[PDB]
Amino acid sequence: MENLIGYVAAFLTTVSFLPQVLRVVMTKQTRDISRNMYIMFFLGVVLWFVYGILRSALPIILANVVTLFFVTIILYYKLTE
Amino acid sequence: MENLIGYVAAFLTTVSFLPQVLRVVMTKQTRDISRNMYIMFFLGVVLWFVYGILRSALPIILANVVTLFFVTIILYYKLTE
Numbered sequence: 336m337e338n339l340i341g342y343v344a345a346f347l348t349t350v351s352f353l354p355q356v357l358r359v360v361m362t363k364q365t366r367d368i369s370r371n372m373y374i375m376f377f378l379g380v381v382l383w384f385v386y387g388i389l390r391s392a393l394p395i396i397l398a399n400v401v402t403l404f405f406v407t408i409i410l411y412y413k414l415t416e
Numbered sequence: 417m418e419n420l421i422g423y424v425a426a427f428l429t430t431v432s433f434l435p436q437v438l439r440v441v442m443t444k445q446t447r448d449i450s451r452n453m454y455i456m457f458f459l460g461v462v463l464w465f466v467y468g469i470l471r472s473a474l475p476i477i478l479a480n481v482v483t484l485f486f487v488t489i490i491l492y493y494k495l496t497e
């Protein structure tokens with residue numbers, strides 16, 4: 336059972352960044368978003384992805400690749416104003 | 417080694433929400449933050465914490481409790497405008 340819980344948790348947590356991507360790409364506004372939040376989160380997802388490759392856990396690699404994508408675009412928009 | 421990388425990743429990801437908490441509690445502005453993002457993220461962290469209890473993983477429980485706190489504060493401010 337627990338594995339299902341984990342998969343649903345990872346899915347939810349990864350796709351949650353998608354509406355934030357949508358809003359950032361639609362309104363082109365990033366004032367209220369923390370830069371440090373997405374910097375630290377960037378490095379965090381990077382290390383989770385390194386942990387996934389180190390453990391050859393493809394589901395962790397996938398979820399964190401999608402998250403790294405989302406977080407990267409959001410951070411880009413933040414940095415570029 | 418891998419365990420260290422995972423722990424640092426969890427740390428980074430949990431503490432990343434702290435600067436967003438700070439900014440939201442100081443400027444009292446949440447316009448550019450996605451509500452749906454933090455809803456899905458909330459439920460995701462809840463399921464991560466349920467997975468930690470189910471696997472008796474105290475570090476997962478602790479990290480996800482701290483994250484649940486931060487995400488709850490941010491979500492509250494967003495829902496209250």
Ligand SMILES: OC[C@H]1O[C@@H](O)[C@H](O)[C@@H](O)[C@@H]1O
Pocket residue numbers: 348349379380383398399402429460461464
């Ligand atoms: O990818 C690493 C994941 O760590 C989880 O604890 C968080 O819920 C997600 O924000 C993040 O995507």
